[PDB]
Design an enzyme around this catalytic site. Structure first.
Site, PDB file in Angstrom:
ATOM      1  N   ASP A  39       0.789  -1.192   0.000  1.00 51.04           N
ATOM      2  CA  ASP A  39       0.000   0.000   0.000  1.00 51.04           C
ATOM      3  C   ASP A  39       0.863   1.304   0.000  1.00 51.04           C
ATOM      4  O   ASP A  39       2.010   1.347   0.497  1.00 51.04           O
ATOM      5  CB  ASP A  39      -0.858   0.075   1.252  1.00 51.04           C
ATOM      6  CG  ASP A  39      -1.993  -0.959   1.274  1.00 51.04           C
ATOM      7  OD1 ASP A  39      -2.099  -1.738   0.293  1.00 51.04           O
ATOM      8  OD2 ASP A  39      -2.734  -1.005   2.331  1.00 51.04           O
TER       9      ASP A  39
ATOM     10  N   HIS B   3       3.893  -2.026   3.073  1.00 53.57           N
ATOM     11  CA  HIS B   3       3.843  -0.669   2.450  1.00 53.57           C
ATOM     12  C   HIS B   3       5.159  -0.437   1.738  1.00 53.57           C
ATOM     13  O   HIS B   3       6.168  -0.341   2.402  1.00 53.57           O
ATOM     14  CB  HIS B   3       3.645   0.400   3.560  1.00 53.57           C
ATOM     15  CG  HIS B   3       2.417   0.155   4.362  1.00 53.57           C
ATOM     16  ND1 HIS B   3       2.368  -0.801   5.354  1.00 53.57           N
ATOM     17  CD2 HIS B   3       1.156   0.630   4.238  1.00 53.57           C
ATOM     18  CE1 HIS B   3       1.142  -0.867   5.847  1.00 53.57           C
ATOM     19  NE2 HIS B   3       0.394   0.016   5.211  1.00 53.57           N
TER      20      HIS B   3
HETATM   21 CO   LIG Z   1      -2.556   3.002   3.213  1.00 55.40          CO
END
Ligand SMILES: [Co+2]
Ligand SMILES: [Cl-]
Ligand code: NA
Ligand code: NA
Length: 211
Positions: free
Chosen positions: A21, A170
């Site tokens: 992400d 991430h």
């Molecule tokens: Co996010």
């Protein structure tokens, strides 16, 4: 694959969905090289400004077998907004992805994994599949060379052993790409696993990953 329904588990045997992400970021290029080395396909749930600024990375994602999904334009918890605010978060992102790919994601992940009935309703209306996660690495909390192994990799192994297969990390974070992604890929390869895209892990043809 239903729309406007929280999905946390792959449905194809022997698959794991590595998902990243908040990108694309300056570390995304090194991460794509690392993935291709392991014949691994991942899913990138991208943000507005990052996508606008990095249309080449989006294209490298698609050209290299990866799936681009939506992560809202502004990374605002969607239960905090009304119908029109949620909708605009998704459509503003679509309008910055379409020029890069010619299509827009039909898969998304809610920021902070926060949903309520109203956000699922908007996602059904906008034809989105809603992807949460079953292996949360907490990589954003463990950005240090020891922490990212001690906790994030350990969390990854413990949840993977418990049958989790949609892995949240991430690619905006240095230690995720420099240390965790390599450790997760070695583990995938060591085990017998197929690292593929979220759509593919759900039995969705690539055509259905975009609209
Ligand atoms: Co996010
Ligand atoms: Cl370990
Ligand atoms: Na599920
Ligand atoms: Na390119």
């Amino acid at each position: 694959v239903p729309t406007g329904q929280v999905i946390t588990q792959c449905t194809t045997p022997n698959t794991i969905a590595l998902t990243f992400d908040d990108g694309p970021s300056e570390y995304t290029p090194q991460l794509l090289d690392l993935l291709s080395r392991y014949s691994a396909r991942a899913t990138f749930f991208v943000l507005g400004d990052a996508a606008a600024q990095n249309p080449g990375l989006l294209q490298r994602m698609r050209d290299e077998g990866h799936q681009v999904g939506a992560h809202t334009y502004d990374h605002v918890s969607l239960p905090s907004l009304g119908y029109d605010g949620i909708a605009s978060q998704m459509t503003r992102l679509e309008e910055v992805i379409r020029p890069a790919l010619g299509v827009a994601p039909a898969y998304m992940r809610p920021p902070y994994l926060e949903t309520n009935e109203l956000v699922l309703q908007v996602m059904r209306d906008l034809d989105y599949r809603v992807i949460s996660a079953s292996v949360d690495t907490k990589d954003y909390e463990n950005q240090d060379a020891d922490a990212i192994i001690n906790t994030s990799f350990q969390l990854f192994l413990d949840q993977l052993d418990a049958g989790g297969n949609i892995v949240l990390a991430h690619d905006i974070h240095y230690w995720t790409v420099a240390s965790l992604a390599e450790r997760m890929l070695q583990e995938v390869n060591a085990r017998g696993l197929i690292a593929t895209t979220v759509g593919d892990c759900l039995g969705d043809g690539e055509i259905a990953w975009y609209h």
